[PDB]
Amino acid sequence: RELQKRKRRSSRPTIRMPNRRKKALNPAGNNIIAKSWNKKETLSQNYTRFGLVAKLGKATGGTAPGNKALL
Amino acid sequence: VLEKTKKRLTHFPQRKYAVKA
Amino acid sequence: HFRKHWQRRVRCHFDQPGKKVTRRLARRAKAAALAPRPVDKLRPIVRCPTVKYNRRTRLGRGFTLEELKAAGIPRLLAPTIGIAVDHRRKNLSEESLAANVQRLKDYKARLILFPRK
Amino acid sequence: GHKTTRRVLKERPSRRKGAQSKRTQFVRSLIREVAGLAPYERRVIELLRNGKDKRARKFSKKKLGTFGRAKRKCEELQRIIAESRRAH
Amino acid sequence: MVKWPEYIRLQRQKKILRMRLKVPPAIAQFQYTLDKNLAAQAFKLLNKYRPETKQEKKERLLREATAIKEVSKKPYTVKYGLNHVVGLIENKKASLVLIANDVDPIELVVFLPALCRKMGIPYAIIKGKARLGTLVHKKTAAVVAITEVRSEDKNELAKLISAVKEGYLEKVEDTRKRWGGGIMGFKAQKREEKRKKSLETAIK
Amino acid sequence: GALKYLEELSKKKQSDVVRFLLRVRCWEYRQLNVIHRASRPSRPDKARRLGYKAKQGYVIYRVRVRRGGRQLKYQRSLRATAEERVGRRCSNLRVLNSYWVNQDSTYKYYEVILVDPNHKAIRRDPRINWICNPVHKHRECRGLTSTGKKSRGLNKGHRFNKTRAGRRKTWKRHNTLSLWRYR
Amino acid sequence: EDGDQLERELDAMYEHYKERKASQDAKYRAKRARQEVDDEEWEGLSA
Amino acid sequence: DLASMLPHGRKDAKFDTKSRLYELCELAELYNCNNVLFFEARKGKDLYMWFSKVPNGPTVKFYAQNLHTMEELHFQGNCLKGSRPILSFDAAFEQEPYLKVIKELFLHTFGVPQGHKKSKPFIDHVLSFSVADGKIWVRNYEIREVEKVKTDINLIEIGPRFVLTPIIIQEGSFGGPILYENKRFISP
Amino acid sequence: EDPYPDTVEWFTSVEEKMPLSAAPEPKRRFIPSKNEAKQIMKLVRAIREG
Amino acid sequence: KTHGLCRRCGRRSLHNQKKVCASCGYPAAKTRKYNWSEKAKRRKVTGTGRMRYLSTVPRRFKNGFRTGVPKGAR
RNA sequence: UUGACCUCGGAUCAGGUAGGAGGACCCGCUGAACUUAAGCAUAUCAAUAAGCGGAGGAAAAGAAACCAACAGGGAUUGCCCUAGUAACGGCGAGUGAAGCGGCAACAGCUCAAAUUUGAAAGCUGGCUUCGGCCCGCGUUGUAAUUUGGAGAGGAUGCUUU
RNA sequence: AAGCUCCUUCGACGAGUCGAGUAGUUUGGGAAUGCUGCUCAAAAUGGGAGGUAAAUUUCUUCUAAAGCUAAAUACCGGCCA
Ligand SMILES: [Zn+2]
């Protein structure tokens, strides 16, 4: 709290952190999956378009009507 | 890394695969 | 039942949607990394232990060594191609052995392998 | 209960944790000879040579804490006595 | 009077205690060692069979590498190292064993004479882990062994086996199962009559 | 196999040879300092079994701590006290593991195996660069050694429900009141 | 050969050390000054 | 409580369950004991009480239930430790062949020989065994003498109160053929 | 009693005419050293490269 | 007077007999601090002073502890 | 006379490292009382507050000397119910888990015990023209192989970089 | 250099540690729930924990006293938003 007041009172600038993340959120590269991945879609929707299974376990809930990625 | 781990990774590295829907 | 200090030990789940979004973003991080691969590993079918729940099956930890051998999947290759391995479990019954080898055959029939480099 | 077909399982080396090691037994015998005996073992040997075997069992129990440990200690010491008599 | 440094005092006190304490036979046997003539003969043979230095090994490997750029018999050397020598003894490959007398912790070699006697391998106890370690190209060798020698030295090795076993093992068989120590001098014995007359006379 | 012979010999402790060696060695340690550098392991089999290697970086320090009780009983062990004192003296080293060497009636003697995290051999060799990592500072002070694990009760089963996974952590978890959004 | 001279030196130094640490109380020194010697140490002359 | 009431009998601590039951016959030979009273606890809840004669006599196994001990403060009675007790047995103990073998095993154990030097001289308590259900009920009473109105006995319960259901009688010290098996025992 | 009794050799008095290990003998104790073969080949590579 | 100036914390609180600061405990290496006085803890906690170097650390972290000069700089 | 080894020392020797701060959360030690109830005493507050020591971005725990009694499950961690149940308590005040089951996330490994013995094959330095030169540590054991639902050695034939 | 296969050959697994008695402390948990201190002090078809009236201590399940390891977990402090 004292450090925050000191920062708000001093003339030194605020070190604004860019929103960097440890792990990327979309496939990247020059491969088929990277070129066909839609970043505005979800994991299950992308895999349903691809024709691939994303989860090999039991369904933990109701899927979308057109979902074909949760075996 | 150790030599035995190096050998194990050399001869059995993570493969690329996919499961059909 | 408040003889202790629940006020200093009380917790609220106001970040339930935040953690849901975070977990969903983690699953997409895994599928961005393991993009053509499923985001999980194939788990065996196991019968629940006690008399209360022995009428049902669930997913177990990993496949047994001899049921992998019967399926025809080598031990050192199964975790690499995405199959969980459990060296502690014993089949003890042809029923469990057959169910799991059939599951592994289905995985084999639906799997696509890429040739190394 | 339910009828499931039993399967014969392979032998488990963790089950073979039971010690049949001839070399380990050799090492134990040689170290016994080299190191000698504890004073309470000397007492037990003295009683065994004088035939006070019941007293020896009682003293071994008092020193060790269990019937089985006392019995094994007395058997080991009787074997030592027999081997010494054969060697002399 | 004068004040000795603490470490000097402690090591001289250990010398006194080593002489005065009654020691178990497994260490009294190490107190018994061999003599100058047998040491000299054993070290003649073992100096003939000393191993190569690092410089010599590097020179040899360079010689063969140069030859390959521009089919050998089995080498025979003195074996050293406790684990290696104990393995040789249990496998009855060692024909002669030499054990240093000044190993500390002693427990590293206290079983070796008994093990050698059980396996039937001739052994001797030599004064020197530094003598032994300079026989090898190290600072200290706790034990060395001769397993196989060349045909030019088979008879010399057999004669050394006979000499060691008779002129050392007969005397140590006479005195190896008895306790050592108890070398009370004038001061120790006088202190003990003082103790006995201070205790056994009137009160205890 | 010499290490196996020493293992059996050390199991035979009240035997004549071991008793004699322990006596004359207890007198030496009583003549020396309370904490001192030991040039080599007095029990090499125990040291190598607990993880002592003959590299540059592995040090052995011997310590004697007074035995007994405070009728109050100290929850940690004399091993833990000896390890903490040796670590405080060698503040730049990481305490790998300790072992009993001699008992005596008024003291108790432990040799502590320590590793230098800053030595190049330790840094390059795996199996020890984990102790080079900074999460292992003062394991003896945090209870991360064998005696610490034993005293804290890190065993699995019905006899360690309260103490495994941390006693204070388990108590806090059991005494938190959890309130969800839709109650 | 039997270490008699070394033992005598060590014993003399040990006795000096004991006497010094004891003679640091001055109650010990008072006791030592007032303590009379015995005759079973002088035994040996004629009786 | 039973060991205090038994001056000819001595205690023995925990017995390994992995040991064979006839190893109890070689523990008896060590202490020169011809009778054994073995308390075997199952699951830490159920007591099974064995009576035998070593080395070749009959043995009886019972399940012990309904235990109350001398430290319970509802008892009100007390007796001399080592005093020889008057043993009272119900009539069924001289009718059913199985209850007659239990009787001689009870007489040998809870008997306190006549001239034993570790006994007390004056007798003040009665140990009673009764057959009410298919079970043996054991009671212990102090004999209180009170003068008659112009001396007669009152009884005040003093000690252990337990119930024993017979299970097996086997011809042997802790083995041999079974001579009796309850066929009506219900296990906890 | 004897405070310092002599050791009766009840185990070492009997001599065994065989080793302890029945384990099989490896090839490398009869054939030349692959370790020196490796080192010599590294030295050959170094000499060829200068 | 029983309190002169303390060089470490600057308060007129060093006993002249005990030679120990009643505020920070100057002769001891550690700075005196107790959990029953949150006001004292927040009086002498980080941020109440100048922040010589800890104020400069975060920007170097942001740029990744990178060293050198820009390419093409004079 | 000299030289090795062992042990113990000196140096403003060459190169390094620890102390303090912070302590929201974390790992240990230490450790109350106010309060409640009960003829009294244990109990409760609480294995809490205060005090001391030690880390990180998480810590800790962790790959069964586990749970079970079934058709068995299968490292650790957390959520939901189990459950205010079992259990201990003048069977007071009260205290009070866990297995199973649904879920989130999942990942397995390194040594000691074996002789490389046909070859210490291992490693720290500091002098470098950066290529390799020596000082040494180490056989009281540094590499490679192995870690018990294993493994080694031979033979054998495919498949691996 | 590595994986697998077969076998008229082998297969080493942690001690003042378990355990016994005892004192204190702790737990829902005297089969002591765990821990610590003192005394004594182990084993090798071994040891530990359970099941079981089933007729004897049969059966079941694991290997302790050496070590590493991300994730899901916590967060009134740090850089921010
Ligand atoms: Zn100040």
UniProtKB/TrEMBL annotation, chain B:
It comes from the Eukaryota. The lineage of its organism: Eukaryota, Fungi, Dikarya, Ascomycota, Pezizomycotina. Catalytic subunit of the oligosaccharyl transferase (OST) complex that catalyzes the initial transfer of a defined glycan (Glc(3)Man(9)GlcNAc(2) in eukaryotes) from the lipid carrier dolichol-pyrophosphate to an asparagine residue within an Asn-X-Ser/Thr consensus motif in nascent polypeptide chains, the first step in protein N-glycosylation. N-glycosylation occurs cotranslationally and the complex associates with the Sec61 complex at the channel-forming translocon complex that mediates protein translocation across the endoplasmic reticulum (ER). It is found in: Endoplasmic reticulum membrane. It comes from Chaetomium thermophilum (strain DSM 1495 / CBS 144.50 / IMI 039719) (Thermochaetoides thermophila). This is Dolichyl-diphosphooligosaccharide--protein glycosyltransferase subunit STT3. Belongs to the STT3 family. Signal peptide: none annotated.
TrEMBL record, chain E:
The keyword Protease does not apply. Keywords: Ribonucleoprotein, Ribosomal protein. Signal peptide: none annotated. One of its GO terms (cellular component) is cytosolic large ribosomal subunit. GO terms for biological process: ribosome biogenesis. Residues 70-157 form the Ribosomal protein eL8/eL30/eS12/Gadd45 domain. GO terms for molecular function: RNA binding. Component of the ribosome. Belongs to the eukaryotic ribosomal protein eL8 family. This is 60S ribosomal protein L8. It comes from Chaetomium thermophilum (strain DSM 1495 / CBS 144.50 / IMI 039719). The chain holds residues 52 to 261 of 262 of the full protein.
UniProtKB/TrEMBL annotation, chain F:
GO terms for cellular component: cytosolic large ribosomal subunit. Residues 145-166 are annotated as: Disordered. This is Ribosomal protein L15. SUPFAM superfamilies: Ribosomal proteins S24e, L23 and L15e. Keywords: Metal-binding, Ribonucleoprotein, Ribosomal protein. InterPro entries: Rbsml_eL15_core_dom_sf, Ribosomal_eL15, Ribosomal_eL15_CS, Ribosomal_uL23/eL15/eS24_sf. NCBIfam families: PRK04243.1. Residues 149-166 have a biased composition (Basic residues). Belongs to the eukaryotic ribosomal protein eL15 family. Pfam families: Ribosomal_L15e.
TrEMBL record, chain G:
Residues 5-36 have a biased composition (Basic and acidic residues). It is found in: Nucleus, Nucleolus. It comes from the Eukaryota. Belongs to the class I-like SAM-binding methyltransferase superfamily. RNA methyltransferase RlmE family. SPB1 subfamily. This is Uncharacterized protein. The lineage of its organism: Eukaryota, Fungi, Dikarya, Ascomycota, Pezizomycotina.
